[PDB]
């Protein structure tokens, strides 16, 4: 690695930095609140009785969790079709309005509830837009919406002057003028009533049994998308650097226990350097500190390929408790060398007053010696007078000029 | 009247924690030593109150004098307006499109003629009894900050803590207070219902985009905040 | 870390970073060169002596008092009261920014300072020009007074007065270094510059440099990969420029520190390890001797100066 | 300029020019810093040449470690090597020292050197070489009594 | 002054300039430091007496 970093084959003696040590996260936990609200789908699917098709009700949902889990409500659906939105991908989408329309029609009339259809229910009772984005759920309800004597409680409009607009509701009961005179508002020849009854019976055929059909209208009006389904629910890893996604706040690190108290409304937390070091868990009220795990830099201490090939590793600025004689110093932690107790001359600088060398055998590590020890006898009546002279030569090399270059 | 807001109008700029540090932020704050309007002797006109950069509402009501607030565009037909009513144990915030009179009163129960909306937002009821409120509207969020501190406006320091958020975007340009009395007045045109009651006074002060330097202590509570465009030392 | 500071735990960001060139292997190289150069400036001034000298047990040099400059064996850290006072006045891994500790700690520099003090007190100036020669302190002071032209009689007769003046000066050194905290600024402001250099990089990471967001997790989740590549490229360019300007400032400050360290080593060699005839290179006035004291990021020289006073008018020919 | 048309490849050339200018400005800055360093080194070398080769200086370690006598320069393709001749004392010996000598009621001090004693004897010497000489009036001066 | 050198009589330009960061904050600080240092060099040679 040192040869690749220096781009050579015969490295010299010393310490060289090659790369950095990083601990990869094992898991990735996400924590959101358990539940705040929920769409009342138990009311629009498990009601005691639904309304007619000419007077269909519409319930607005704007402050609830859009949890699409219709599977537990009569899972053997007879007609489960989706328009514009995928069936399974709908659970991970946000919208503006979650208007839900419900009505009861015949078995052979469920096909008319679709974008671009022609018939009595589609044109005179309930019309869907062409570019409709939603889902249509229909299930059999013969046991509930039919009696032996005839369930004439559900009515439908059969005659009307013109077709209904998409998402239009009309409850008018005016006598339809089929002839030339308005009949002055009486029932007679060419004066027919618009609403007709069904009279569901349990002995009817599959095409005539009542089918509770519900329409989930979806639309996006560039709103903050208050409605949203469930996100996730995981545990809390301790003493290990993992990936946290707390309420959109994403990061990687260790979540350790702390003792500082926060405010009831404060959830996040930053230091003076604008670094996220504290975040409140959405599951339970408890603050934890964000501290990174083992992180630093690796350095190879080599005596040079001319002598031998045994090298030593040094992790700088990181404790080596977590992930060959291991020894902890003040400037880092070195492996591959043994700490000697006799101080010699410093050869390879490491830091904090520790230097490595080759004993001649293996890499050593010793506290650098500042020199020898010599204490002169200081006396008020003694002196040291020289006797001999020595003429020595001292070399002092200093650069003068440089390489004149131009581009 | 007109009073001087010496050192009040500060709030938390974000839901972050800090420990004995300094934070300089350019937000929409109330300038210190500003000339606010004190409407204390107006015991039921002037219903034109803008909502350009927010509202700083200071109150010293004894007990349950103010019943709520109104925030609309023009208070006319087909106008998105939010009415907030604070009862004894429940609070309601309803946004709808309806016309309002000159002074909607409560004692009453039905302000306008018809209110056909299906909005739902229920939270904890809000209402030496100083009560400060800061109302802003930004990024489709109608943010409100409330604080109940003892004691008109003294030289103390008290921040505004955010409690609830409401995602809604409306070009609000109106502001109306809701007074509570005893006598009945059903006529919307007659704007004369002065009755002897406790002290009623609603301060009005407009916010401004300014830079504030706040000091967060070890507990994470705003204990000092200075402006940058009122003094050379600041 | 040129890979971690620009790219925050991202693989494709690191794959795109190598397209700029060899800047990651150049800025880190310049930084480690600056570190090695700073590791050498500490050995050109404090490590001038070859052998460590010690103080004799008899605390009687002739009448002078060196208790404030000699190390005190009572305290755990073997330093002088002046060094302990100076140490209590210098106020001292985030996003891939580490601080490498120096080789010579505060203990080895203290040992070098004590050795230099012992050499300049017991041996005089012979410890810095060859073998150490024993010599009494009053005779060394007589040599230093004769080197500037003053006869040795004024010292061999009026010795108690000079000793009392030196003791009073050593005592008032601490009182003068206690007040006016702005004196120890040259050792702090540069450190403050580090506080304005190591923290200014993380402060600029919050800026989007024109992009939609500052963190990569939002860009790689909101925008599409093919169209968000320009935003990542602009962020990498901005971070590279913000790191290059920091490297340039560090190079300039390292050159300044090298010049200051060369000047300090020259003063240590020409004032402590001998007496110089220069005017104000070893303090204003007539220089006699100099005592060095260590500091976590510098050296304090105390120069003894002989100043004439109480002059009188006379006739000359 | 061959794969894409100039009107559609202008931003690429602009970005290339910007990157190359940014890479060259850093080189220019490094060259300026290194030129300042070399200028300081050359000024120091010229000062040492003037104060060590063209005369003798009284500085301690500016013209070599020890007592400087002379200096010889030697050229090199990118620098200069100074060979400093240093006189170093050695083979020192212990002797007894005294400030002055009190005789005839007067305290005499030496002019050059000091008084060395090796046992029931006293001589005058210098501060750099042992030369025992009898205490005479030429190398001594009276400056009062030994009171 | 970067606010005037980079943005000539423009408010949106000044708003977008702060988005870059604290480059001007350190640039003007270095300029003031250079000014103070040049004001100090005249007192170390002429103001010795
Ligand atoms: C979520 O459930 C846990 C376990 O019962 C509970 O401790 C916590 O308070 C719940 N969250 C909220 C917001 O109530
Ligand atoms: C090998 O070469 C290195 C390079 O400087 C040198 O330091 C070392 O002494 C050499 N070893 C031998 C055994 O020649
Ligand atoms: C590293 O961890 C060990 C284990 O507790 C500890 O004894 C040692 O002091 C640590 N090193 C540093 C520099 O804190
Ligand atoms: C140094 O001393 C320690 C403790 O006395 C011992 O554990 C270690 O083995 C010694 N090292 C060598 C190289 O002997
Ligand atoms: C506030 O404004 C009113 C009228 O706008 C004025 O009469 C009053 O003096 C002002 N107060 C201060 C403190 O300037
Ligand atoms: C009005 O206040 C009463 C308590 O006096 C409370 O029971 C009721 O729920 C409140 N009404 C609303 C709409 O908040
Ligand atoms: C030297 O001074 C210190 C205090 O400055 C004092 O405690 C000590 O006794 C003095 N020693 C002598 C020999 O005067
Ligand atoms: C010498 O005399 C002058 C006036 O003739 C006077 O100003 C000066 O102070 C005198 N010198 C001293 C040392 O007093
Ligand atoms: C002088 O004497 C001391 C001890 O009395 C001794 O350590 C020293 O070596 C002697 N000097 C010489 C030059 O031998
Ligand atoms: C001292 O040195 C002198 C040199 O002139 C010599 O004559 C004398 O004998 C010596 N005395 C002793 C005791 O060595």
Author numbering:
A (entry chain A): 298 to 620, 640 to 676, 690 to 736
B (entry chain C): 27 to 70, 80 to 142, 157 to 176, 187 to 210, 215 to 297
C (entry chain C): 737 to 828, 854 to 1078
D (entry chain A): 981 to 1127
E (entry chain B): 737 to 785
Article excerpt on this structure:
Dimeric hACE2 bound to Omicron BA.2 spike trimer with a dissociation constant (KD) value of 0.4 ± 0.1 nM, which is approximately 11-fold higher than that with WT spike trimer (KD = 4.7 ± 0.6 nM) and is nearly 2-fold higher than that with BA.1 spike trimer (KD = 0.75 ± 0.1 nM). The enhanced interaction of Omicron BA.2 spike trimer protein with hACE2 may be one of the key factors that contribute to the increased transmissibility of the BA.2 strain. To gain structural insights into the potent binding of the Omicron BA.2 spike trimer to hACE2, we reconstituted the Omicron BA.2 spike trimer-hACE2 complex with an excess of hACE2, followed by size exclusion chromatography and cryo-electron microscopy (cryo-EM) analysis. We observed two distinct structure states of the BA.2 spike trimer-hACE2 complex. In the second structure state, two of three RBDs are in the open up position, both of which bind to hACE2 (2-hACE2-bound BA.2 structure). The third RBD is in a clear down position and shows the direct interaction with an up RBD, as it was observed previously. Particle classification reveals that about 42% and 58% spike particles bind with hACE2 in 3:3 and 3:2 molar ratio, respectively, albeit an excess of hACE2 were incubated with spike trimer during sample preparation. In contrast, in the Omicron BA.2 spike trimer-hACE2 complex, the spike trimer bound to at least two or three hACE2, indicating a stronger hACE2-binding tendency of the BA.2 spike trimer.
